[PDB]
Symmetry: D2
Subunit: 440 residues, 4 copies
């Protein structure tokens, strides 16, 4: 699945609809990023620029101009076609092909932006600009405005009002269209297949990075060349480190391994966590903690639907965790009092859910304590976990256990749809999957 030309056009028009008449919106591409010396990281387009264009080049700026309630047009600044530069550093769209390819009215050379941008802004009332996003963009915009302010003798005038478009655009991105959901559905499927493979390939004596290798190979073979975030493969005590990415330890017989990994597919993030035994068999202690995390996830998946909130569902998860931990002797006392003093916090220190989209921790207002009421089209994660430190003062058999189970969901009219249910999470299904692979 992919985003259509018509969809990119609908998005631009949805932004223009919200703009004041006599205004321009400026959306800048991400700069290229150095890895070491003259070598650069693989390019990642700015998510907001991507959202409106699907254009994966640096040194580009989309300018949407609204003259009035009926009249508007678009101008793209982008890199010129240069024979030498392209023979070396790959093909460029250029100005001639851009209008048809990207559906813009006019395309100009990025090298002319300082000579041209002020002419587009001249006489407008409002400029929409994400100030502070990129230094290079701020320099360009501020130079244009200073030329206008100082140009009264040349009959130039600057827009006196500057508005940050990020709140408006981020509210747009928070609600996914059917096309976006189709892409996310594919990202969830590719990511699930990778996690299934990792479970099937895992053996004691392999290093954590070997599972990272299997995962990335699986992403790649489905056309998702890059992960959406740095893959976490935390076995044994490494599972208690939330963003463990060193992945440098030999995986030991008797340990769990926690894998948090997600592909980026057409710009959209998958984000799945599975935890499983390195040797294919959960111990009683591992099983006891796993069951609490799994009940929390399964209950959350039943509960999430329009009209509730992350905060509300979190309250139900907290009760499940505290109750579970009291039965194991990890916490001691009255459940309601323990809940009241947030006694689960040492073992579950992060949020249950975040938005998901073009960024793995996606944009959009959560409300105070993530109390915002959920509506259809919102996409989020559900990721309960329990992390018991090696030095925790609890019964000894629980020490050094880190378990998280994370799925990705979309809120629908009546409930939710689980985009990542195709990789198993019940302990018996995990064990059966691993047994079958070890035959083969």
């Amino acid at each position: 699945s992919e985003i259509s030309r018509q969809e990119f056009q609908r998005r631009r028009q949805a932004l223009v609809e919200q703009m004041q008449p006599g205004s321009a919106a400026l959306i800048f591409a991400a700069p290229e990023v150095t890895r070491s010396a003259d070598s650069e990281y693989p390019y990642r387009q700015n998510s907001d620029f991507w959202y409106f264009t699907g254009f994966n080049e640096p040194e580009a700026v989309l300018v949407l101009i609204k003259s009035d309630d009926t009249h508007n047009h678009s101008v793209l600044f982008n890199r010129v076609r240069d024979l030498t530069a392209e023979i070396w550093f790959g093909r460029r769209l250029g100005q001639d092909a851009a209008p048809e390819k990207l559906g813009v009215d006019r395309a100009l050379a990025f090298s002319e932006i300082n000579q041209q941008l002020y002419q587009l802004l001249n006489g407008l009332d409002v400029v929409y600009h994400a100030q502070g996003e990129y230094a290079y963009a701020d320099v360009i915009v501020n130079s244009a405005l200073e030329k206008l302010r100082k140009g009264s003798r040349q009959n130039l005038t600057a827009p006196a009002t500057m508005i940050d478009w990020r709140p408006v655009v981020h509210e747009m991105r928070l609600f996914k269209s059917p096309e976006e959901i189709a892409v996310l559905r594919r990202a969830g499927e590719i990511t699930a297949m990778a996690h299934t493979r990792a479970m099937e390939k895992c053996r004691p004596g392999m290093f954590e990075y070997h599972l990272e290798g299997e995962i990335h190979h699986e992403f790649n073979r489905h056309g998702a060349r890059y992960p959406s975030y740095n893959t976490i493969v935390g076995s044994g005590e490494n599972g208690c480190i939330l963003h463990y990415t060193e992945n440098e330890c030999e995986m030991r017989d008797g340990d769990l391994v926690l894998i948090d990994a997600g592909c980026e597919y057409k710009g959209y993030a998958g984000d799945i966590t599975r935890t499983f035994p390195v040797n294919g068999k959960f111990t009683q202690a591992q099983r006891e903690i796993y069951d609490i995390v799994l009940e929390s996830l399964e209950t959350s998946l039943r509960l999430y639907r329009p009209g509730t909130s992350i905060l509300e569902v979190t309250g139900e998860v907290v009760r499940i965790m505290v109750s579970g931990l009291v039965k194991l002797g990890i916490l001691k006392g009255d459940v309601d009092e323990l809940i009241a003093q947030n006694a689960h916090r040492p073992f579950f220190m992060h949020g249950l859910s975040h938005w998901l989209g073009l960024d793995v921790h996606d944009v959009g207002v959560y409300g105070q304590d993530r109390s915002r009421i959920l509506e259809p089209g919102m996409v989020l994660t559900v990721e309960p976990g329990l992390y018991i430190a090696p030095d925790a003062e609890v019964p000894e058999q629980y020490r050094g256990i880190g378990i998280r189970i994370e799925d990705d969901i979309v809120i629908t009219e009546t409930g939710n749809e689980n985009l990542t249910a195709s990789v198993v999470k019940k302990p018996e299904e995990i064990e059966a999957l691993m047994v079958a692979a070890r035959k083969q």
Copy 2:
């Protein structure tokens, strides 16, 4: 292989030996780098900082202080141990463990650097600093020097002399030690195994990115988690684009595929290019161009040794290329006159060789036109290629062909050693490899 504790110590002392007495050298870690929003790229340490420490954390500064010809010591600024920050964002070395782990005399918290750096620079004559390398570093150094300059009432004085250590350090990096050659040898072996795998897996109907996938999986399984540069898999007309990295096309029966890929193993880069037929059998036209590129490589591998230069070996390659292109009717005229007017340039527009090490395009002075005399311990690539554009005014059978063959070598006392010869390059050996894999 690996770089030992003792080696890192030897490198630091070799720098200190070149410093003036009453001086300090400041070496800064790379900043973390945003990929998108709050997510960051996998961390890549600054090569110079890595060279002296083997320490893979940001927000760190190595300070080497030379009081006089016999007295010197080291101070590390690095991130403090913080229980919360580490539970979230991974373990940190901290101050207590750093002296023993990294072999430094003293370790201080990076958060204190502005309160402490000026105290270390106070009263010195010279500061060694790579000005302009990182903005955050320049801010820290300039703030320290300003405090000192303005602090005469507090009996503070600034060093009046600032020296860029990069020329000295880059000259050090240009000559590899035996330990570094052992690591580069392993990087070359891992990289060669990945290229062999790609040749064995290649089938028409696969996409270019599938071979990139096979290559990266092979790097990873040997403990090289990241490539040293973005992998190029250019099939058909994409082979004519030197740094083609989109890798987005379906590979077609009848085309060649050019793969330039290299692992990063313990910080050191492999850098290998192989070109081969997608269907396992070179056509006559493909073979005609391939043979010119291969002769260029084989001749270069015979010639490279102490006392010659990249410029000198390039001259021999240019003669091989022009002669070959004249025989095929791609160029027309007298070979010597064609050579004199650089008539090969449309088809071979890059250099034959670059230095290789902690960076794929490694540091070190080349001399004018890469005329520097080679000496033992230098590591470099040898990468002749011919790229005939789809619209080139040449016989049709040669249009749209891009071929490069690249090996990594070390200059020895008498010649060179080839670190990447374990992946095949003779056309009959390539074909035999692919036939065997397809059984």
Copy 3:
């Protein structure tokens, strides 16, 4: 005369009246300015900050907050009282005395601005800020906004709209109140007295800077310690250089001297130019050029009134100049054709009039080609001049003559009032003044 506490308060309220509800306006003081090494120039407050406060300290920020159409309040950030700093570098108002002295609701220490400003901006819809005016101010404002944008977990939100207040404030400053006119009337009088003194003191053999000395002494004795711009004393060929400020030549018998000088009185600028013979007697040639400039000035003074424009009056002056220059043989041809080709331009290359106020070249929109229709309360200069270069291809006796005569006026209901008419400009009155002084 001076500006009352009540006037500063009226100005602040006039700005607040124009502000959107749920907004804050930020007005920053001028930074201190280095002259050499550790020594600084005498402090000059930012004109807009001065306009709203009459407060002559650096490191101060006025914040006007409008909650709604009826509720508003003011906060001042200013330097704290520090015993040591004040014993050295003079007295400071401080926080305790500021509310009563400056009529602000609340005063805070400037050293706390980064800890406090974001708290004032939190939850507002609009911030009014003159972006690009001062680097130090931009840093403060941008830091506050980034704290708010990034502080959603602490229930902080940034105003998404930023508006430049300069257009609004500069339109306010363009129209002078009766109190301001009274101050400008005094500035004009002090400046006129200085020009009269210079004429009376002038002798051949003095240096140009000696007249600058007399002028500055006269400003000072009336309580105007500083000039409003760098004094110009251009004798002989120096009179042809519009902003000649070297004032380094010995004044010669037979030359004219052009003096452009103005005091700054309570922040307001005088701006007068007189040209006169060093030896007290105009030659025929000097008189011939002087008469053209004087007719231009006198005609302009008759013409300026509500409903005309600088552009319109300039057209009448151009006709006077071209006609005059044709009769002298300086220009040759038909007057209307010469006017049509702007043939006066080599001899009169600057504008006839500029706004005057807290800045000598005062703020306010002029309109295209200074075509804006004049209204009561506007204050402007009238400064025709003719400058004939030493190498000009004209009759030889005119070469090297520079003459300008400049008065300051206020537009009134029926015409204008000349604020600088108390220094003479008719050639016979100039000569009589000088004769009388030489007795002284």
Copy 4:
């Protein structure tokens, strides 16, 4: 007096003599400075740039290039002659006239500096640059060095060593030549005449700023158009504020007025303070404090000579002050114990002396606690004072009294010469001066 062409040349050569071979020194003009909106303050050239050129334009850079021990030359970047710009904003020297006028070998347009500076720095070993002095200069120098560092393919190389010339130049400025002493002598005379005039014109009912007016008029009539610092006229309780410059109060019969004012003559600063009674007659209480300050000055003027230091002379002044204050009952106790606890500090909180020259607080190393040994050619102020706050817990008749007496001296082979002795300071001479003027 004036500084000659030959002197500017001698100064440049004295800098070049201290430079390493294969180096360039870069000296930048001061930027223009905004007063309000489009209006600028009167231009004040950078003192170091002035010292080497006597050139009073912005957008200028002096480049001194030393090829070797015998070969050196100079390049000036300055504003081009532009007919329109000059008709408006005054005459410019330009490129054609600069070599002869300023004694430079070559002059280039400032607008070309980014196209030309890197070409001058190319291949040098050392650049002398005052980093951090001006932002515009740092941008120009950093851009040049970046072009060179990145320009190896164009056969460009950057100097790896950057040295701050300010320590060397400021040590030069610390020792005045005979020509400079002649200019400072004239500055002292002009300044003294202004102070005499202020004393003769002073009347009760005048405002403090009226005396500032008389002073500036006197500076101006002798060709010193600008003061070297903001004039202080502190009458009554304003005399206790060290840098009181508001000068806004009516001067009252019964008060003292403290005037600290100095002209700037050919770039050089006068710096004189005199305190005197507004009504022409010192009261007993005023005289009691005045006499302590005057004894301090007179003793300092006897003591200052080669081989002593500001610190050493300060010790004698402190004894005079404490002894005097004890006699008046302002301090109580044993003199030696009071001295040991610095009991004078509440009343005398600044230094006795600072260097004087192109800046009023001139450049040059003072040593710890101003302990540097004085040598011939150093120019400094001598400015004891006593400031008793209005709320000080001392006898009432001394509260709110601020007295300072300041002279400018040059250290000679055997002692010192007083450049400002032509304005009176003995109380009976002050009174006689004022009585005579009031007839």
